[PDB]
Structure 1
């Protein structure tokens, strides 16, 4: 039986963090009202909004609510009455936000910008409007060596006009 003179070892962390991040959403609870889910995306239907075709600006509003409680109780958030606001190829996703805190207290923030929109596609005619975007949470590159990278959160819409 031989003694160890010198030894080294190497062990990562980003896969455990990924497990924690994915686990928190997957083991969580959802309550949906007036909203669907398909193709890994929540699904909205509306009949409301205004679109400026000249400046290519508009707002499309949708009824319906989503209430999420993360695994354990860590994140607890309701999002309702989403609005997609666009001005050219940039925009905002706005909604009624309610969130609960450490010890069960629920705070209503009213209309809140959920996130900012980067449009890869945006079309507006006299009869239709549509777009495709990424939702960015409104630099953490220093954490890239131990934190898994962010995931694209897609958003898209089509509207008939009148």
Structure 2
């Protein structure tokens, strides 16, 4: 209650980091503000899962087509192609809105004759039905390609559709829309069954707007590798989950945040930070030590794209240390099309002697966007983040 009251409005932030990675010393200063109460109806993050059609997958990888699929921005888990978005708008009261996604799926078969491309899927929904749209390029039985453009491919019928102030989710059965039947070369009929689709969206979120500058010259590691190190007290905890917000309960005295970040097939970072109020300003002061990095790896060789994915940060109580234990895996895109995993191990313990909230298991849904200030000549990073707590019904 006393800690929560400090975050009801816009709070100024100051970040100070001193690092040493493989003997390369550097310093980063950051400024900006946080609004843990920000939120509207805009989709700040979203995810969908859709197998297209189970029998179509076995066909593409079967002995008639003798083909495969290639994904750019799309994943694959539990037999479904997984997509990510960060654009849309939901009216929670009406259970209606839209979610726009990214990625491409390419299906190949018959010595290149078959070349089905479905990109950037989008959903319009209303609680009873919806439509799934996608940018579709295909080919006929003689190889000749066709551009269908943005086309309606699926008629949705929601088994469930839920929407609250901070989130929306749903699962819908699907039938082939007449407008997308041509993409399947006359093999599927309009109205025939397709795989069901599942989606979840974050509405609004605790918004961080910050700008970081390397005060020692050129940063010796990629800016994306420092995002997690560079104030989880700015997360938006829904009303029904406010008794699980450790971060704000430790304020204003603050907390110590410690991490070990293992970069797969590369070195590791060890960080110690103190996050507390210094007057009206929330300050994050960090010490970072990096060791065992490869000179020509993705980190010291600067082979990581200047972008950031959306992750789930898993939180558990640590009663014996009067704090929390946090775990998550960051996926950094590599310039060659691959992914550099950064395994995060975290501990937070209060600085003060007062009581804190020890939470039930839950997670923070984080979204980050990296950009540059066109008028800034120093090595820098502009970061915009949206974080919402979830996982407790």
1:29 equivalent in alignment to 2:71: no
Provide the C-alpha distance between the structure 2 equivalents of 1:97 and 1:22, rounded to a whole number of angstroms: 17
Q: List runs of 5+ in structure 1 lacking aligned partners.
A: 1-19, 139-149
Provide the C-alpha distance between the structure 2 equivalents of 1:92 and 1:107, rounded to a whole number of angstroms: 22
- TM-score, normalising length from structure 1? 0.73
Displacement of 1:103 in angstroms is 2.4
Q: List runs of 5+ in structure 2 lacking aligned partners.
A: 1-54, 178-191, 205-393
- In our comparison, the structure showing a higher alpha carbon Rg is 2
Provide the C-alpha distance between the structure 1 equivalents of 2:104 and 2:78, rounded to a whole number of angstroms: 18
Displacement of 1:55 in angstroms is 2.1
Displacement of 1:88 in angstroms is 1.8
Provide the C-alpha distance between the structure 2 equivalents of 1:67 and 1:86, rounded to a whole number of angstroms: 26
**Which residue of the partner structure matches residue 200 of structure 2?**
158
Cα 1:22–1:110 change in 2 (3 A) is closer
Cα 1:37–1:55 change in 2 (3 A) is same
For the residue of structure 2 that corresponds to 1:24, the secondary structure is: helix
Provide the C-alpha distance between the structure 1 equivalents of 2:110 and 2:142, rounded to a whole number of angstroms: 15
Displacement of 1:152 in angstroms is 5.7
Q: After superposition, what is the alpha-carbon deviation per residue over 1:94-138, rounded to whole angstroms, capped at 9, x for unaligned?
A: 010011123222211111011111110000111100000112112
**Which residue of the partner structure matches residue 127 of structure 1?**
166
1:52 equivalent in alignment to 2:88: no
1:99 equivalent in alignment to 2:138: yes
Provide the C-alpha distance between the structure 1 equivalents of 2:58 and 2:203, rounded to a whole number of angstroms: 41
Cα 1:156–1:40 change in 2 (3 A) is same
**Which residue of the partner structure matches residue 65 of structure 1?**
104
Provide the C-alpha distance between the structure 1 equivalents of 2:92 and 2:193, rounded to a whole number of angstroms: 32
Provide the C-alpha distance between the structure 2 equivalents of 1:83 and 1:151, rounded to a whole number of angstroms: 19
Displacement of 1:53 in angstroms is 1.9
Higher RCO (CA < 8 A, seq sep 6+): 2
CA contact (8 A) 2:99 2:123 kept: yes
**Which residue of the partner structure matches residue 137 of structure 1?**
176
Provide the C-alpha distance between the structure 2 equivalents of 1:103 and 1:127, rounded to a whole number of angstroms: 49
